[PDB]
Symmetry: D2
Subunit: 251 residues, 4 copies
C-alpha cells in the first residue's frame, strides 16, 4: 500500500528537520528523492547517502528559496537529472518570536520571504514542472489557527497564508490532476522546537512538552513524514485542498 516506486519527489529544507524524515520516508516508499538544502550540505549528503542505503536514488541540490531564480533552477536541475517530477514538498521554514511592538521591517521580511513568499514560488515551479496525477505538499503550523501563543504573531500569519493558498491551489492545479495539501505540524522535536520551547534546559522542556499530548510523548519528524507519505500517495488522492494538523491532541 501507498508506495511511490518509479516516482521522483522534491523536498525543500531536507538536510535537517521534518524535511529530512519526509524525504527518507519517501525514499523508503520507493520515491527517487531531490534533497534541497541552503546552508547544511553535510547532512544533505547524509540523507542522500541514507536514501540510497535503503535501496533508492537521491541527489542533493543547493538553492535559496528566498531567491525565486534559484527555485526555478532547483526544479529545472531536478527534472534534467531524474527525468520527471511527481511530488514536491514545501518544507523550508524559520521561527520568529517577539511582541508586536518590537517587530521590525527586517525581521518581518526575513520570516515571510521564506515561510510565505518562498513556499508560494516553490509551489508555482512545482506545478509548471510536475507530471499529471502529481502531488504538492506545503508546510503550515498549528499556531496558524489552533494555538495562539503570545509574542508569536509574525510566524503565525506567515503560515496562515499557507493554509489559505493550498485551498485555492487545489482548484487551479485540477487541470493537471495535482492535489494540494499543507501539513500543519505542532510540537515536533527539532532545532526549531527547542528554540521555541523556552517560551530550564531543552531535555527538561522536552519532558514537560510530552504532557500537552494525551498520548503522553513528544512529536518527532517521522510522525509528520508518515502523513505526507500518505497524502503524496495515490491512496491519499481524495484529501485535496485540506490542512492536516499533526500535533497529537495537544494543547
Amino acid at each position: 500500500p501507498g508506495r511511490l516506486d518509479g516516482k521522483v519527489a522534491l523536498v525543500t529544507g531536507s538536510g535537517r528537520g521534518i524535511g529530512a524524515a519526509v524525504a527518507v520516508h519517501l525514499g523508503l516508499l520507493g520515491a527517487k528523492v531531490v534533497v534541497n538544502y541552503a546552508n547544511s550540505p553535510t547532512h544533505a549528503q547524509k540523507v542522500v547517502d541514507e536514501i540510497k542505503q535503503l535501496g533508492s536514488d537521491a541527489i542533493a541540490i543547493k538553492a535559496d528559496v528566498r531567491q525565486v531564480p534559484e527555485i526555478v533552477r532547483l526544479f529545472d536541475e531536478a527534472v534534467a537529472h531524474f527525468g520527471q517530477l511527481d511530488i514536491a514538498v514545501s518544507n523550508s521554514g524559520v521561527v520568529s518570536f517577539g511582541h508586536l511592538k518590537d517587530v521590525t521591517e527586517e525581521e518581518f521580511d526575513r520570516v515571510f520571504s521564506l515561510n510565505t513568499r518562498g513556499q508560494f514560488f516553490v509551489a508555482r515551479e512545482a506545478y509548471k514542472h510536475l507530471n499529471n496525477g502529481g502531488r504538492i505538499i506545503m508546510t503550515s503550523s498549528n499556531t496558524s489557527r489552533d494555538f495562539s501563543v503570545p509574542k508569536h504573531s509574525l510566524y503565525s500569519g506567515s503560515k496562515g497564508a499557507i493554509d489559505s493558498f493550498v485551498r485555492i491551489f487545489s482548484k487551479d492545479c485540477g487541470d493537471k490532476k495535482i492535489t494540494v495539501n499543507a501539513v500543519a505540524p505542532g510540537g515536533t522535536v527539532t532545532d526549531m522546537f527547542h528554540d521555541v520551547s523556552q517560551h530550564y534546559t531543552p531535555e527538561e522542556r522536552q519532558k514537560m512538552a510530552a504532557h500537552a499530548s494525551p498520548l503522553h510523548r513528544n512529536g518527532f519528524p517521522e510522525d509528520i513524514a508518515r502523513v505526507v507519505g500518505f497524502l503524496v500517495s495515490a491512496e491519499g488522492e481524495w484529501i485535496n485542498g485540506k490542512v492536516l494538523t499533526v500535533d497529537g491532541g495537544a494543547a
Copy 2:
C-alpha cells in the same frame, strides 16, 4: 507499508456503503474485521466473504446501534470471538432533507438516535473494550461546517457534534493510549448519495464539482480511515479529516 496484521477491527454498518470498503480495506491491510449491520444480512455476508477472500478472517454480527444495550452486547460479542479489539469504526448513519419549518420530532429523533447518540455510545463501548494503543474512528460529513446546503439543517447538527466529540474524546480516551478522529466524507457514491442526489445523470454532474473531475467513491475514504487506524497515523489525533476531493 502500514498494515494491521494480528490486529482486530469492528466497523458498524459495514454490510453496505462506505463502511463496507472500510471493512474490506482493513482486511486488505490484514486486520480481522467484525462487519456490523441490522436490516441487510446478505450484504454483510458477501463482505465477510470478500474479507476471507484476501486472506484475513471476518464475522457478521447484527446490532441496532440506536439501542445502547445492543452496542454493549455487540462489543461484548466481538471480543468474545477474536479475543480482543484494536480498531472501532463508527460508520452507521441515515440522511434527511427538510426545511426547518417541516422537521418533526419523529424525524429529529430518527436521525440523532443513530448519527449522534449511536456514534457516541459506540465510542463509549470501544474505549471500555479496546486494547491500549487502539483506534476509534467516527463518521461526520462535509455538510457539517463546510457546506451550507439548503434544507439540510438536521443531518449537519448530528455530524456537527461528531466533529466536537473527537476533539474532547482524544483527551478522554488517552488514559489508554487510544487516538480518536473522524472522516468527513463528501458525497461518496453509495445508496445514500442516490436517495439524496436530490435519474443517473444527477451523479454525472456531481463529478465536475471536485477539481479532479470525478466522483468520491467509498474506497476513497476507506483509504483515509486505514492510515488513521495504522501505527503510522498515531500523531493524527482529535482531527476530523475532510475527504471532499476538492469539491465545492
Copy 3:
C-alpha cells in the same frame, strides 16, 4: 444625535431569561427599547425581577413559563408570546445545562438530560421562531467556545450538544432566509454564572476560582452576562443584518 441599534416597536423572546446570560440578554434588549417575553421553567420569582427591572427602564415584559425540553410547551410558549404582544420579531435561545464526566462514565440518562435541552430543545425553539416571527426578524441560538475553539477534558457531552448548534445556524440562515430572517449564534465562553462556578471546580472558594480565572484573559477579567447581551443586541438590531449564518465567540480572546 444618532442613537443606534434600538428595538423600539419590536417584541423579543429569550428562553431561560430568569438567571444568567438570558436575564442580561433580556434586560439589555429591554434597555434598547424592545418589549420582551421572559421565559423560565423553575425560576419564576427571578423571572419576575427581570420583568420589573425591564418595566423600570420604561418598556413592557411578561414572564411565560415553559420547559423547552418539551416541544408542545415550546409551541405554547411562542403561541402565547404573540397572543399577548400581538407580534414577535426577535427570538433568543439561551436555555442550556453543563456536564463533566469521562466518555467512559457518560450514561444514557445524562446524554438525554443534556442533549434534550442543549440541542433538540434549541432546535425546536429555532423551528417555532421561524414560524411565529415577523419577516425581517432575528434568531440567535447559544453555543460555547468548548464547541471547537477549546478541547477541555471530560467535557465531551457539552461540546457536542453545543457543537451541533454551530452546524445548525449556518443552514438555518438559508432556510429562514425566505422570510428575510438572520440566524446567528453566540458562544458564551466563561460567563460568570451559576454554570461557571459549577465548572470552576475543574478546596478553592468559587470567588478564589474566578479571581484566578480572570488571569486567563489577555484583558485580565472575567466574562459577565452584560458582555454577551451586548453582542446579542447588535446581532438583532436593524444594523446587525449582514452578520447572518455565523457563530460569534465572546470570551475575550481568552485561553
Copy 4:
C-alpha cells in the same frame, strides 16, 4: 450606548469604498476621524466634509501604508492633531486575479505589501500610539477560509495571514487592554467589486448570492466595525467576523 463621544479613530484608505463609510459611521457615532488616503485626495475631502457636516471634526492625512516610514508619520501626526487615538481601522485594497502559473514576483510584492505587510505595521504603529483600552481592526475576506474562488490564491493568503495576526495580537495588545479583531467582508459594492464581478447585470445576479436577496454595501460592514470598536463590543477580542449576509 454604541456611541464614540470622546474617541478619536483612524481608518487607512478611507477616501473610497468601505473605509470611507467606516470613517463616516464613526463620525456619526461621535468619534473624531483621521481619514487616510494615498492616491485619491478629492474623495478624502468628501469624507472629511460629510463627517464635519454631521457634528464631528475630521482631517485628511496622506500615507503609502506600503512605506512603513509613512505609517509612522501618519500615526505621529494623528496623536499630534487630536491629542489621542483610541480606535485604528485597517482598509488595504489590492485585489489580484490569476493562476499560480502566471503569478509573478512583482504582483505578490504588490498585493502582500499593503494587504499583509502594510496591515501588520499599521497594527504595530496603532499599538504604540493608542490610548490604553483602545481598538485595532483589520480587513480580510470571506475568500480567506470559507470560500475558494479559482484564481484568488494570492489575495486569500494576503488576508488569511491577517486572520492569524489578530488572534495573537489580542494577547500582545492585552497589556494595554486594547482588543484586536478583523472584519472579513463578503461581496461589498465598491470600486474593487465592479473590478472582479468578472455592468449592473453582473451585480443584479450577485444580489442573489445572499439568502436575503440583496448585495453587501459599505454601510453593512461600517456598522459592524462600529460595534467592534464601541465600548460595548469589548468581549469580542481576537476574532474574524465574516460579514457577507450568509452568502454562498
